[PDB]
């Protein structure tokens, strides 16, 4: 099976440098032209660079020309992308792709994420969202969890350590003033809460933070 595995992604300040690698296996690497193709946060696909099978010829769009260098080591079955003078608009998932006889992209790796930002790492506040105080309760109840003010992405959010997965919606994070905010809702039958425990579990790997917030009813005063 053709296999392409990218590595080297990370969070870098504007003006910084990063070198990506792509380990190729399951085909004769030296026989194929290769490209890097990136996908921006807006899900736009952008070709970044191409290199010939033998490594002698390279091609770039003007967007990265003079900043990025594609190279390959045929003996090591590896493709590289040296990135320099990084800009916010270079933020993307970077994929390694094997070309056909022409530059269609027949096989793609899983991608390595590059984030170019000066924003400071910030742990979120995690807030339990219980229904309005003294609200008349219907047949179902909806609870929430607000994860406010973190950087970078991602967080992981579960309910009851992942045991509560039905009736859950976790909303995509929104970015404001260099901080993300996310929320999650969970809907259960009213006979299950608050008689049974519901807890939001949030981890933010970049800040090594993990918090559990049990949803408790508002009140009694």
């Amino acid at each position: 099976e053709v296999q392409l595995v990218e590595s080297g992604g990370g969070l870098v300040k504007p003006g910084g440098s990063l070198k990506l690698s792509c380990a190729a296996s399951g085909f004769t690497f030296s026989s194929y032209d290769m490209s890097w193709v990136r996908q921006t946060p807006e899900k736009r696909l952008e070709w970044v660079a191409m290199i010939s099978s033998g490594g002698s010829y390279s091609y770039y769009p003007d967007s990265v020309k003079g900043r990025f260098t594609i190279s390959r080591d045929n003996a090591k079955n590896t493709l590289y992308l040296q990135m320099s003078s990084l800009r916010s608009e270079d933020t993307a998932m970077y994929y390694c792709a094997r070309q056909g006889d022409y530059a269609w992209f027949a096989y793609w790796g899983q991608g390595t994420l590059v984030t170019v930002s000066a924003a400071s790492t910030t742990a979120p506040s995690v807030y339990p969202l219980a229904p309005v105080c003294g609200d008349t309760t219907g047949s179902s109840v909806t609870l929430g969890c607000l994860v406010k003010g973190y950087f970078p992405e991602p967080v992981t959010l579960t309910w009851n350590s992942g045991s509560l997965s039905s009736g859950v919606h976790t909303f995509p994070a929104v970015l404001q003033s260099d901080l993300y905010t996310l929320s999650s809702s969970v809907t259960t039958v009213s006979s299950t809460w608050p008689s049974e425990s519901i807890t939001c579990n949030v981890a933010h790997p970049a800040s090594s933070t993990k918090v559990d917030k049990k949803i408790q009813p508002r009140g009694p005063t």
Binding site: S35, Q39, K43, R44, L45, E46, W47, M50, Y59, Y60, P61, D62, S63, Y95, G100, Y102, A103, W104, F105, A106, Y107, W108, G109, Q110, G111, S125, Y127, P128, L129, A130, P131, V132, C133, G134, T142, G144, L146, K148, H169, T170, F171, P172, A173, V174, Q176, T181, L182, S183, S185, T187, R218, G219, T221
Partner: protein, 214 residues
């Protein structure tokens, strides 16, 4: 550079329906075009190359046509797994360029949102801020409007919205709206209201609470 204009940006269809996506090149490129699929959380995969040739292992319900500037990609009978994104790409000339993509979504019966409002948590009210959250859950179709009012006054400043992708289980959409104020401003007002406008009713769904009432 060759601009690839892909249409539509999104389209809703039923299971079993035939759909056609178009890609327009800004100059003639013969048959030097490819089409890709991308499933959520996965890398793009080649479906069609050289305008009409199916990649190895691709089902024959996928096809491509065209030469010159106007290209078509067709799915003859949509299967559940096909409601994802598709992109065209030219390889006629560097720089290689992609269309903007098309997302296919599944149709279902109209459903009104279930609306829930959440006052700031007691824990948050220890910060400089106070967030009021409104969930508009499990509605169809995707278009919806939310309005916030504070003491009857429409509030735009400090509102941020987030929308889920179509639910894989029930084909509905959900939306979260968060109004963030300073704690001081929160405590200056009494009534907080989230109003949802959706095609399922001529009247908005209104959820409200009064601060420090139980």
């Amino acid at each position: 550079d060759i601009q690839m204009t892909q249409s539509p940006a999104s389209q809703s269809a039923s299971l079993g329906e035939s759909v056609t996506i178009t890609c327009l090149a800004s100059q003639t490129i013969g048959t030097w075009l490819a089409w890709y699929q991308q499933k959520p959380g996965k890398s793009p995969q080649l479906l069609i190359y050289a305008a009409t040739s199916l990649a190895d292992g691709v089902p024959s319900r996928f096809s491509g046509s065209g030469s010159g500037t106007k290209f078509s990609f067709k799915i003859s009978s949509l299967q559940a797994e096909d409601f994802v994104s598709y992109y065209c790409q030219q390889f006629y000339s560097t720089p290689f360029t992609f269309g903007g993509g098309t997302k296919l979504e599944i149709k279902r019966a109209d459903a009104a949102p279930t609306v829930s409002i959440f006052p700031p948590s007691s824990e948050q009210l220890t910060s400089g801020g106070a967030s009021v959250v409104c969930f508009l859950n499990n509605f169809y179709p995707k278009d919806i409007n939310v309005k916030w009012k504070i003491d009857g006054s429409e509030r735009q400043n400090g509102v941020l919205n987030s929308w889920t992708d179509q639910d894989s289980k029930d084909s509905t959409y959900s939306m979260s709206s968060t109004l963030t104020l300073t704690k001081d401003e929160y405590e200056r007002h009494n009534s907080y209201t989230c109003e949802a406008t959706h095609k399922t009713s001529t009247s908005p769904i209104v959820k409200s609470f009064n601060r420090n009432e139980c």
